[PDB]
Amino acid sequence: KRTKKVGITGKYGVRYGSSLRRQVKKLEVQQHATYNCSFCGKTCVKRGAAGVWSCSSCNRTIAGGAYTLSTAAAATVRSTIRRLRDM
Amino acid sequence: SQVFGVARIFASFNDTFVHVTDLSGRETIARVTGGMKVKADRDESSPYAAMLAAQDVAAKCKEVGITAVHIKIRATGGTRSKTPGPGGQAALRALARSGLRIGRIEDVTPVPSDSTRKKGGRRGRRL
Amino acid sequence: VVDPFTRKEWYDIKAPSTFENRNVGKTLVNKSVGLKNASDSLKGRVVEVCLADLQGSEDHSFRKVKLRVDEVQGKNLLTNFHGMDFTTDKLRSMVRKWQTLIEANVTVKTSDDYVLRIFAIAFTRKQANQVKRTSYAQSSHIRQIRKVISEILTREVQNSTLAQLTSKLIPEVINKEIENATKDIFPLQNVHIRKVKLLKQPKFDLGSLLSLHG
Amino acid sequence: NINQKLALVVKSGKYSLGYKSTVKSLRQGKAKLIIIAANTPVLRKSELEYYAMLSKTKVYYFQGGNNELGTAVGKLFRVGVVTILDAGDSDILTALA
Amino acid sequence: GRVIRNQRKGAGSIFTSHTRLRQGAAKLRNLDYAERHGYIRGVVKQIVHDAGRGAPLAKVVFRDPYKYKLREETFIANEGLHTGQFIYAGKKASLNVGNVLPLGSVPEGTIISNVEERPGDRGALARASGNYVIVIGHNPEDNKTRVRLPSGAKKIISSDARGVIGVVAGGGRIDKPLLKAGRAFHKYRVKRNSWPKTRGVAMNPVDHPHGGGNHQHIGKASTISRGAVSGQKAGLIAARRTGLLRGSQ
Amino acid sequence: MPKKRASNGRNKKGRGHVKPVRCVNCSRSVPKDKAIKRMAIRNIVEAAAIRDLSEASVYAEYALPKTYNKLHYCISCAIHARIVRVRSRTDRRIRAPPQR
RNA sequence: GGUGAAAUUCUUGGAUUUAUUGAAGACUAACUACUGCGAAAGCAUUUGCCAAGGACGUUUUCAUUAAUCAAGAACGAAAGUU
Ligand SMILES: [Mg+2]
Ligand SMILES: [Mg+2]
Ligand SMILES: [Mg+2]
Ligand SMILES: [Mg+2]
Ligand SMILES: [Mg+2]
Ligand SMILES: [Mg+2]
Ligand SMILES: [Mg+2]
Ligand SMILES: [Mg+2]
Ligand SMILES: [Mg+2]
Ligand SMILES: [Mg+2]
Ligand SMILES: [Zn+2]
């Protein structure tokens, strides 16, 4: 463990201030991390330009949220439609 | 022979409606209430006003041509009391005394399944 | 100053037709004026009325029935059993302390496009002889009973095209089939349906309605 | 349930993991039952499902993807499709599943 | 005085957008026969980041029902579309994330985007990242749905208006702060030329109403008439309220 | 101040912290245990009708139902009028339902 | 509407009231008890899944593994906080 708590956002050093570092850390973790690929099965990497993921070892591509594969809104709307399709 | 209204007496505290309707509900007949018939503000809920509200409904009923009514009642409901008012039952005497006929009486006070929060807050109305 | 009490019309409501009468009573509307017609206004009116009004007898004075107006044919307007209901005062007496009550909600597509939801009150029986003041069913038993009642109401709803499902519902034939199967688990009293709600319905099928009027 | 039964295979029983070996063994006819994952692509699902019908084999759809079938067959790695050549101790052959 | 920083914009010389990197006019299919009766399968070939766009695009390929040829159309990708998905568009297609019905076929509750204002607009409402219309109502007498737009402003639309089911991609972009000017730079550098904004107040009273004075201050109500004028309109235009807004929108 | 009571809030025994019920009058949140849960089985029509209603009515025998207000009261609210009735130290041990 | 005795306060270019819905995010009554479970905090509409758990029974098996515990931990009402 290098950083007690700047984590990834330690690139930014002493700039921008603990609140705007924290906010970004949360989403620069999320965006830089590897999903699990719905189809492939596998799990690496990959975001590439906001709301566009991915390829792991496969090559597809998938519209997601900016900083995460699935925004919560997407999952709830998947349900909303899951419910309203069944009617 | 007996044409049916549905009297629907909303007697909350501090008020009494008497709202005669068709059986579908849509087309009304009257909406005579307590604070209509007595200009005292206080005396809306009181029997006097409820009687005087129902008799004006009784008069307005017979002109259009209704014989009988289904006495529904509604005490406030849910977020308030759930407890029938003072001029709910004094309305029922006035519906009877007028000669407006009566058949299948209910109180459809919407006692909630699991109400959303009441008035007052936690400590309540501390008079 | 208008006063539309003179400017009015009196049409007749038409019950259909597993009950005794085929007429309930007498609603009203305004006339068929330009733009806002009378036939288009009357379709989509629900006359919730008692089941002792139709059948006459006091055994069915523990019930109500929603009656959705679909067609208007020569003043006389028809209806359809949109849903079933108890008045509030009836079920609350049957819920007494010192015993379990049970519900059972069952969503079911009929043969027609009519997604019926059906409920099922079913109290636990203060058994003969009892001195356990209570009559509390153990969760496990109520989790079977609620399954069994669903296994009933998946079978008798779905099947028989909805119109006949009323003919089974009206005279509490489904209600005994609940009791009979459940006695192997736990006795139970009363047992009705309480409500039947409705979600889906196709294009009117204007003329599907009148198969209950002749 | 299925997971208990595939455990009963993997301890004492003969079973193949993955596609080529599945297919090898559909063409040999040794395959008595193949357990296909979900996420396994519809193409290769439909390909197995074709071969299955020529071999008159059961195709149980393990509800859930391939990381959780590997789990279910006491494997670490993800497995897209299992075959059950022989597992007389277990009841998956007798079961419709 | 001069013409203001924000009167010229209109002229459109520099304050024209930048459309080098910009991929394609993000638009639905053209309507009729096929997709006003039954439906058609598209195929999502690519999902593709668009420069200067709230949310990535999808080259969804269909087939010309009258020529042996393919047409590729840039839909605004809804969180869910993925290369080699089958999009289905038109009346008889079903409720799935990426399909494109007409509000009519779409039950109340549903969640739609690239909703056409008028039908045949090839998309208007709810096209930016994360946004979506909710179909509130249905008036089958005079076929026109009520629809909520991200603003909130509920609005009556023709029931033959279309719109792609699902919520739009790039959702929750603005979560992140930018930090560092530079990232704001590169944001707008890829769109238009509004960025950095100097404050009227800071400028000379030549150059902007607020400008000048021996203290940077406005000095006459930053609220401005709606019936004001090119150059008068710098400050809070046609405000109802002002000040720190409490509560719901 | 020692214990007035052994029970205090009563139902709650072997039972962490139960849910509460808003009272009737004051709308005073009180636990559904401390609650003074009286049952008001009142007729839908008051006694001094009832004749009048049955005279003007259609049918015979009739529904003539009873509304089932299961009340609650915030003890204080209850004392101010209701069943409570401040008992003697020795009498406070009695759980017997009163009257009857 | 509201009223605590009493007032203010709102619309009428039918608000309210009557009926059909829609959305949203809430809660999840009546039963409901000197009842249940949970280490507590806490937990009541439904089914489903996920593992866990007490008691129970047991001519099961290991054979001292056990009780409580400063350091350290895990959870932890409401409020508050990003
Ligand atoms: Mg206050
Ligand atoms: Mg003291
Ligand atoms: Mg004291
Ligand atoms: Mg002390
Ligand atoms: Mg305990
Ligand atoms: Mg506690
Ligand atoms: Mg219990
Ligand atoms: Mg409950
Ligand atoms: Mg310690
Ligand atoms: Mg809190
Ligand atoms: Zn109180």
* Domain covering F1-100: architecture: 2-Layer Sandwich (3.30)
The alpha carbon of F75 and the centre of ligand 10 are apart by a number of angstroms equal to: 27
Read off the tokens for F34.
């401390």
Q: DSSP labels for D10-63?
A: HSSSEEEESHHHHHHHHHSS--SEEEE-SSS-HHHHHHHHHHHHHHT-EEEE-S
Chain C positions touching B108 (Cβ under 8 A) are 87-88
Helix (H, G, I), strand (E, B) or coil at E15: coil
Look at chain C and report how many structural domains it folds into.
Answer: 1
What residues does C50 pair with on adjacent strands?
C64
- Cis, bond preceding C157 (omega within 30 deg of 0): no
Q: Phi, psi at residue B64, to the nearest 5°?
A: -70, -35
The answer to whether F26 faces chain B, any CB pair under 8 Å, is yes
Touching chains B and E? (3+ Cβ pairs < 8 A): no
F92 conformational bin, left if phi > 0, alpha if psi -120 to 50, beta if neither: alpha
Helix (H) or strand (E) holding F3: none
Residues 68-127 on chain C lying near strand G, CB distance under 7 A: 91-92, 95, 97-101, 103, 105
CB-strand contact B74/G, under 7 Å: yes
Read off the tokens for C190.
């009363």
- Out of A16, A68, A81, name the one closest to residue E96 (CB): A81
The answer to whether A84 faces chain C, any CB pair under 8 Å, is no
Residue B14 vs residues B48, B76, C87, C94: alpha-carbon distances, Å: 13, 10, 26, 32
Tally of helices (H runs) and strands (E runs) in chain F: 2, 4
Helix (H) or strand (E) holding F82: none
Helix (H) or strand (E) holding C97: none
Read off the tokens for B1.
């022979």
Chain B positions touching F56 (Cβ under 8 A) are 95-97, 99-102
In chain B, which residue's Cα lies nearest the Cα of F59? Answer: B103
Q: If you search the block for the tokens 């055994």, which residue do you land on?
A: C59
Contact by Cβ (8 Å): A28, A9: yes
Q: If you search the block for the tokens 């301890």, which residue do you land on?
A: D11
d(CA B105, CA F56): 13
- Structure resolution in Å? 3.6
d(CA C94, CA C123): 8
What residues does D35 pair with on adjacent strands?
D60, D82
Rg over alpha carbons for chain D, rounded to the nearest Å, is 12
Asked whether residue C68 is domain-assigned, the answer is: yes
Q: Phi, psi at residue E208, to the nearest 5°?
A: 180, 130
CB-strand contact F23/G, under 7 Å: no
Residue E226 vs residues E209, E242, F17: alpha-carbon distances, Å: 16, 15, 59
Which nucleotides on strand G sit less than 7 A from a protein beta carbon?
1-9, 14, 16-38, 40-48, 50, 82
Contact by Cβ (8 Å): E18, E52: yes
The alpha carbon of F2 and the centre of ligand 11 are apart by a number of angstroms equal to: 26
Read off the tokens for E82.
């993925």
Residue E69 vs residues C37, E90, E100: alpha-carbon distances, Å: 50, 20, 22
d(CA D43, CA B101): 74
* Domains of chain B with CATH codes: 1-127 (3.30.420.80)
Contact by Cβ (8 Å): C185, C148: yes
d(CA C145, CA C153): 12
Amino acid letter for position B35 = G
Contact by Cβ (8 Å): E78, E117: no
H-state helical runs in chain C:
38-42, 51-54, 88-94, 139-153, 163-169, 174-182
Helix (H, G, I), strand (E, B) or coil at C102: coil
What residues does F40 pair with on adjacent strands?
F69
d(CA C122, CA C149): 9
Experimental technique used?
cryo-EM
Read off the tokens for B84.
């029938």
CB-strand contact F32/G, under 7 Å: yes
d(CA B44, CA B12): 10
d(CA F15, CA F3): 20
Buried b (16+ CB within 10 A) or exposed e, E92-101: ebebbbbbbb
DSSP code, position F15:
S
